[PDB]
From a paper:
The crystal structures of apo Mtb [name] and the Mtb [name]:POA complex were solved using molecular replacement and both structures were refined to 2.7 Å resolution. In the POA complex structure, there was one molecule of POA bound to each Mtb [name] active site, which was located at the interface between two adjacent subunits of the [name] tetramer. The density for POA was clearly visible in a difference electron density map made by subtracting the structure factor amplitudes of the apo crystal diffraction data from that of the [name]:POA complex, as well as a polder OMIT map. Because of the internal symmetry of the POA there are two ways to fit POA to the electron density. We choose to position the molecule based on optimal hydrogen bonding. There were four hydrogen bonds that contribute significantly to the binding between POA and [name]: two between POAs carboxylate oxygens and the amide groups on the backbone of Ala74 (2.7 Å) and Ala75 (2.7 Å), one between a carboxylate oxygen to the guanidinium group of Arg54* (2.8 Å), and another between the N1 on the POA pyrazine ring and Arg54* (2.9 Å). Thus, POA binds to the active site of Mtb [name] interacting with the same groups as the substrate, and this is consistent with a competitive mode of inhibition. The POA binding pocket is relatively small (206 Å3) and not easily accessible, as there is only a narrow tunnel leading from the active site to the inside barrel of the [name] tetramer. While we cannot be certain through which portal the substrate or inhibitor enters the active site, the protein must undergo a significant conformational change to allow substrate or POA access to the active site. This conformational change requirement for binding of molecules to the active site may account for the slow on- and off-rate of POA binding.
Author numbering:
A (entry chain C), B (entry chain A), C (entry chain C), D (entry chain A): 1 to 24
E (entry chain D), F (entry chain B), G (entry chain B), H (entry chain D): 25 to 115
Amino acid sequence: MLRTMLKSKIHRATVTCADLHYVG
Amino acid sequence: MLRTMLKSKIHRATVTCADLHYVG
Amino acid sequence: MLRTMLKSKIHRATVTCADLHYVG
Amino acid sequence: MLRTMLKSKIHRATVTCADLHYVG
Amino acid sequence: XVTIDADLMDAADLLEGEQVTIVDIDNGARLVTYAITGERGSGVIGINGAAAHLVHPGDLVILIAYATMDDARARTYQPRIVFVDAYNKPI
Amino acid sequence: XVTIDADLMDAADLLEGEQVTIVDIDNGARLVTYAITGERGSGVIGINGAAAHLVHPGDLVILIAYATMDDARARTYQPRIVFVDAYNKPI
Amino acid sequence: XVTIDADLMDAADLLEGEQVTIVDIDNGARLVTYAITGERGSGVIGINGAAAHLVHPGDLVILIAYATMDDARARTYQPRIVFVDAYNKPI
Amino acid sequence: XVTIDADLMDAADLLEGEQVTIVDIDNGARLVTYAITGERGSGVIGINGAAAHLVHPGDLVILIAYATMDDARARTYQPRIVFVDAYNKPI
Ligand SMILES: O=C(O)c1cnccn1
Ligand SMILES: O=C(O)c1cnccn1
Ligand SMILES: O=C(O)c1cnccn1
Ligand SMILES: O=C(O)c1cnccn1
């Protein structure tokens, strides 16, 4: 039996930018 | 072949508190 | 490398009942 | 320990058609 | 949760407690729940609990289960796809 | 995230950090988060962070954990189902 | 479900029935469905069933597949990334 | 997708291409995307593509990755939890 566990958390980071039309 | 199966259920619990700005 | 694949599909079934307050 | 990783991406495809009442 | 006629569960290769995605053709709702075995041949598709807010009696739905499988098996695996009449009986 | 009474976590076989699905009977919200151990016997069900927008104190919720398991074990596995009173104590 | 041009499926290393996430650049919809093989070189991206409520013809979409893989392989794995022209032909 | 400062990815044990859940403390949005490595020490948290409809510049977010692991390892595994200042630098 395999459980799904938290491994990574970045807590209360601030979004610095957003691009709808990103290419990558 | 791995299936995703119910393992845990807490049925009809009452939410007692909430914190939007939790740290942990 | 494991892929996530369709294994089961019930196509265009009709919902017969709904119970918000089901216990089970 | 298994991670979920990106394996496939089709970037900025155009949806050509849609069928609400598809059978398949 | 979702109560499914045992015949459709056998036809679709679903176990009691197996995770199931319900998608609603009528209202576009999409949720994840688990299968409960319903009375065999009754054609029951029963939405239980919180899901009843999103998926309503009379709605046309698709029930989907996925599996994780090694590349080799993934290329050869045949999914169990069940078409049903207006009374939820297999065709 | 969700802070759960250690008694409910033991009863439901949940570990700290185990992925949990919360479904809200009151508002139909459905989200994925992880379990945090709450003060034992306090009956705490605490919604922490962004989830607090969707799931509110006083709401009736179902907390669900899934496991990935080989076909053989999936057919035989018995889930841990915990019923609770209005004070979040097991029955 | 999503019908994809067999050329894009080969280019992206997708199998018929492989789970696919569709994200809609136009309306911000995000859903999970599976790949169906479409007529090769037709540039078809067809949204089938309940998903058609959320993702519409003319919309720019990103189609994503994930894999579960052991830590060692995860650190080295190179995903298949397919760029396409306005006619859904690979570049 | 989400561009993350390489320092936060190392701190959180995230790989380029690893599936990531973003939850928005400001607007309650919840989505699944993958990590892209951002300029080290820049404190970049960049929302790319469709996700920009849901998660906006200035929003406080939590970035989460989960792993599937055998019962024994699950009970002993220590998750990498990174607290950050207003400039996205670890504490
Ligand atoms: O009430 C529901 O909608 C529900 C219950 N258990 C699991 C998933 N969903
Ligand atoms: O803030 C939340 O709602 C949250 C936090 N961590 C994991 C999942 N969800
Ligand atoms: O109709 C849909 O949107 C659908 C169908 N099968 C699987 C996933 N989604
Ligand atoms: O544009 C997005 O939001 C996106 C792109 N790739 C993967 C997941 N999400």
